[PDB]
């Protein structure tokens, strides 16, 4: 008839928590040598049976923009990139003046020659050498109108560290397991816009394959949507939040290059050797990225008809990025080992007015879009890590048979009584990429104790 306290151990309840997560990778990346990408020496081998469980009555409140997993992944990837550049060649003695002329009798016009004076293995003697440096990596060191004295762009702020040409920058997918006593939820809803309640919360002990690609606009290889275009944003009122569009169907992109001769081995100091671009045998052509026209057109139209839900009676327009350096306003990526910085003035040149335009032509798929790309070697991605990695050159031609899954738009500041809101692409920090990928998951803490009253009185 009375009530007494009764202790239960094994109660399923949750509190919000922040913890340190694992790394789980596939078993095929361990059978090679040491130091391939990051994951041969570090991550645990996952079992080939991921147990996913669906919870019955559970409704939980998710938040995409308030997540610790994105900040933890950003810190881990920053630490990995700083760690992988520790036992590598630090090209300090390349701060000498570069005597540069044209590349030939009407030759390259994009790569200068820049013969310099370098240090051999014996510090008493010096030897004359040469390379071929790209145009964005050289600044005209001159106090007058002298067209022969040049220097590198890196010997003005902070040094370099040449990337070791035995590791690769290939994005191997990594899983994030949770520690024991912690769980990771996963929202399986279809109309999930990033924030709000979820009615299909599931159980995942270790997340799916997350490929840590690096890109500013035009989010490359990753997970798609499931049934329609889904638009992720924080507020959609202020014009300072990066609106993220998650595509449903991919659009093929391919990028190429001309044929360099070889990497040139120039020895500096006792045993260090930096690799530089040698000749360019053959003709001098352009590096360009190719996107199909009709697929991009109706993909952008579907993004327009999905974005017109939030803005009822306004047209949708697009134009270029809003000016600045080449590292912000251009679609930049890294595959093949050579960095690209591609112009995007032809992709985002169009409009939508609410009326659908069909494209009923299958033999007109030959028409495509070309983007004039530029290639750098001195790389300045992440502020505060020592962002002066020198990417060594590579021998043959390269091909970029890739896949697009998203966009990173940004609404422009509208004027008075406007009905032509324009959307511009924007890059920014990598938390946008790793929050577009990690939008499902949320980490919780299990508290097994719990008290409840019943009629059980303990016998003395």
């Amino acid at each position: 008839e009375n009530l007494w306290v009764t202790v239960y151990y094994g109660v399923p309840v949750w509190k919000e928590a922040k913890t340190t997560l694992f790394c789980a990778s596939d078993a095929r990346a361990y059978e090679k040598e040491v130091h391939n990408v990051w994951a041969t020496h570090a991550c645990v081998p996952t079992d080939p049976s991921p147990q996913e469980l669906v919870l019955g009555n559970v409704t939980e409140n998710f938040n995409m923009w308030k997540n610790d997993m994105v900040d933890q992944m950003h810190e881990d990837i920053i630490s990995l990139w700083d760690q992988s550049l520790k036992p590598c060649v630090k090209l300090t003695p390349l701060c000498v003046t570069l005597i540069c002329s044209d590349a030939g009798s009407g030759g390259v016009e994009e790569m200068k020659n820049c013969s310099f004076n370098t240090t051999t293995e014996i510090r008493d003697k010096e030897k004359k050498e040469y390379a071929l440096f790209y145009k964005p990596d050289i600044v005209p060191l001159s106090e007058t109108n002298n067209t022969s004295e040049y220097r590198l762009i890196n010997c003005n702020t902070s040094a370099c560290t040449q990337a070791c040409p035995k590791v690769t920058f290939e994005p191997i997918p990594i899983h994030y397991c949770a520690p024991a006593g912690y769980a990771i939820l996963k929202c399986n809803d279809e109309t999930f816009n990033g924030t709000g309640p979820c009615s299909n919360v599931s159980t995942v002990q270790c997340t799916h394959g997350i490929r840590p690609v690096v890109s500013t606009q035009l989010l490359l290889n990753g997970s798609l949507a499931e049934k329609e275009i889904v638009i992720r944003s924080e507020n959609l009122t202020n014009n300072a939040k990066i609106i993220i569009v998650h595509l449903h169907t991919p659009v093929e992109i391919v990028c190429t290059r001309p044929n360099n001769n070889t990497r040139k081995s120039v020895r500096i100091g006792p045993g260090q050797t930096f690799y530089a671009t040698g000749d360019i045998i053959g003709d001098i052509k352009q590096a360009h990225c190719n996107i199909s026209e009709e697929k991009w057109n109706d993909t952008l139209q579907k993004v327009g008809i999905e974005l017109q839900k939030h803005f009822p009676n306004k047209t949708i327009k697009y134009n270029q990025s809003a000016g600045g350096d080449m590292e912000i306003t251009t679609h930049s990526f890294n595959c093949g080992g050579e960095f690209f910085y591609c112009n995007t003035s032809n992709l985002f040149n169009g409009t939508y007015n609410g009326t659908y335009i069909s494209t009923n032509s299958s033999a007109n798929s030959t028409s495509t879009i070309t983007l004039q790309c530029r290639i750098k070697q001195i790389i300045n991605m992440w502020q505060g890590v020592g962002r002066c990695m020198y990417a060594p050159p590579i021998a043959g031609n390269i091909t970029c048979r890739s896949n697009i899954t998203g966009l990173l738009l940004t609404r422009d500041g509208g004027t008075n009584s406007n009905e032509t809101e324009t959307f511009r692409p924007a890059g920014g920090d990598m938390r946008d990429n790793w929050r577009s990928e990690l939008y499902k998951y949320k980490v919780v803490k299990i508290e097994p104790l719990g008290v409840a009253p019943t009629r059980c009185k303990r016998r003395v």
Partner: protein, 131 residues
């Protein structure tokens, strides 16, 4: 409701069912509390898991519930904590709502259980010294 089929619930599997069917599933949820930049994030997690499990086991073992899951105490339940019926609690809720309505009144309960445990041990010592 002991029959779940495949016994793989993983801290969470009966978090939506009622409390009558959620007191039969304590073993499969209590089984899993224990089981270079990435060579140290693996090793800190094992230490914190051992710390949390040892804290929970000690706090369970202070007030007499040594290894039992459904353990019973003799602390009288104050009516100023729930103000609901017994069958309403055990039928119309799951553990999440109860954790939401109990979370302000936990330290007083823990202190009362530990005081009653000390009284029980003192009375047991006196009774064994009577003989």
């Amino acid at each position: 409701a002991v029959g779940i089929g495949a016994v793989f619930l993983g801290f969470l599997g009966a978090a939506g069912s009622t409390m009558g069917a959620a007191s039969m599933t304590l073993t499969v949820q209590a089984r899993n509390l224990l089981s270079t930049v990435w060579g140290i994030k693996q090793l800190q997690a094992r230490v914190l898991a051992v710390e949390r499990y040892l804290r929970d086991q000690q706090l369970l073992g202070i007030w007499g519930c040594s290894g039992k899951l459904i353990c019973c105490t003799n602390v009288p339940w104050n009516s100023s904590w729930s103000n609901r019926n017994l069958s309403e609690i055990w039928d119309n809720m799951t553990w999440l709502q109860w954790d939401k309505e109990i979370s302000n009144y936990t330290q007083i309960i823990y202190g009362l259980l530990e005081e009653s445990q000390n009284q029980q041990e003192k009375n047991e010592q006196d009774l064994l010294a009577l003989d």
